[PDB]
Amino acid sequence: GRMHSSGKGISSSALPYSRNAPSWFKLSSDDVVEQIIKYARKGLTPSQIGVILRDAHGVSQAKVVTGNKILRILKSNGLAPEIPEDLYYLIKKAVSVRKHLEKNRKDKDSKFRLILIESRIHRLARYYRTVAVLPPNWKYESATASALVA
Amino acid sequence: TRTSVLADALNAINNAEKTGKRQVLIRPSSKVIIKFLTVMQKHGYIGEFEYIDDHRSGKIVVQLNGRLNKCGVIQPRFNVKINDIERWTDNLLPARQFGYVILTTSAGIMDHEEARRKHVSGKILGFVY
């Protein structure tokens, strides 16, 4: 627990045992799919798309309604990000703390956090190369990383 | 991290049996656990155990009877040849007349007495007495 910390918290989501769409749910399989795509074009990440689905539109699980995962729908509609969402956000946070460091050199805590973040990037990046999501020559460089998160 | 569900199962069984409890919850369940209990159940060492489905790894509720002395795993799963069994029985089991060596074999999970009958050998998997 807490790969890069000492915490042991367990706060998380608990999907229901029921894998079938609720009785009160009136939307069809496809209507969700284009509804997903409509928010996809607004730049909303799959985490954001799922969040806005349940909050305002009543989609508890997109897999129990559409049959396929939110990101899997995006890939078959050509909307899957080149940089995966979790990797994307790790790199963007890495840039922001880095930028914080050229104005605050004495923030040793910021330097230590930056090492942890880039440590997390490379482990997640090594995964995406064993599974052919990223090119086998993919490398994270701090100098020009802002190009990928631009 | 959680490296062996079989070890976490027999331990919670022993930590319940010494405590005198007549039931114990096992989490998570697996085929290796379920087939392990059956070898224990056909010898009366435990009672009617239930499998809970939670669309997940699974859970097991075991019923305890009080005839179990000590059940434990042998980790790592050493490779045991037919001439390797007599050494494993002597060191692990209190007496030559009772107690079992659970071996996983190409023929299935079995104790050393059923293993010697059909003269097959595999990897040692635990013990019970």
Partner: protein
């Protein structure tokens, strides 16, 4: 659990670990370093012939108060001078200066014995005759 590797592919880590920790054992360390072959006066031998240089009486360690009568012997095999005990009531008289004495250990295997300070060897034969046979006067010294 138990702090040492148990995985099935970890036979190497155990092989190196044990061999490293055998060096803390002095029996193993003395054998491999060959300290007997280098620094031990016999050079790892059981007995040795040497030449007596001078006879010495030594004050004892506490609480015993006595004199242990040993001699200065130079060894013929490697030219070292080390002290050897003469053990028998009145066997100092049997040994003379510049005699060839066959020495042995005290059974402490390189360690000082009893209250005797700085001495580890004892005379077994003088002029080719056992000092026990001379103390019992079974034979007589050749001279």
């Amino acid at each position: 659990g138990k702090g040492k590797p148990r995985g099935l592919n970890s036979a190497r880590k155990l092989r190196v670990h044990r061999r490293n920790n055998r060096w803390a054992d002095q029996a193993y360390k003395a054998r491999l370093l060959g300290t007997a072959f280098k620094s031990s006066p016999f050079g790892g031998s059981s007995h040795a012939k040497g030449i007596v240089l001078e006879k010495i009486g030594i004050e004892s360690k506490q609480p015993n108060s006595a004199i242990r009568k040993c001699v200065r012997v130079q060894l013929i095999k490697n030219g070292k001078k080390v002290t050897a005990f003469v053990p028998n009531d009145g066997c100092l008289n049997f040994v003379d200066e510049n005699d060839e004495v066959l020495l042995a250990g005290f059974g402490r295997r390189g360690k000082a014995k009893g209250d005797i300070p700085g001495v580890r060897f004892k005379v077994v034969k003088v002029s080719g005759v056992s000092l026990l046979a001379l103390w019992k006067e079974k034979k007589e010294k050749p001279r």
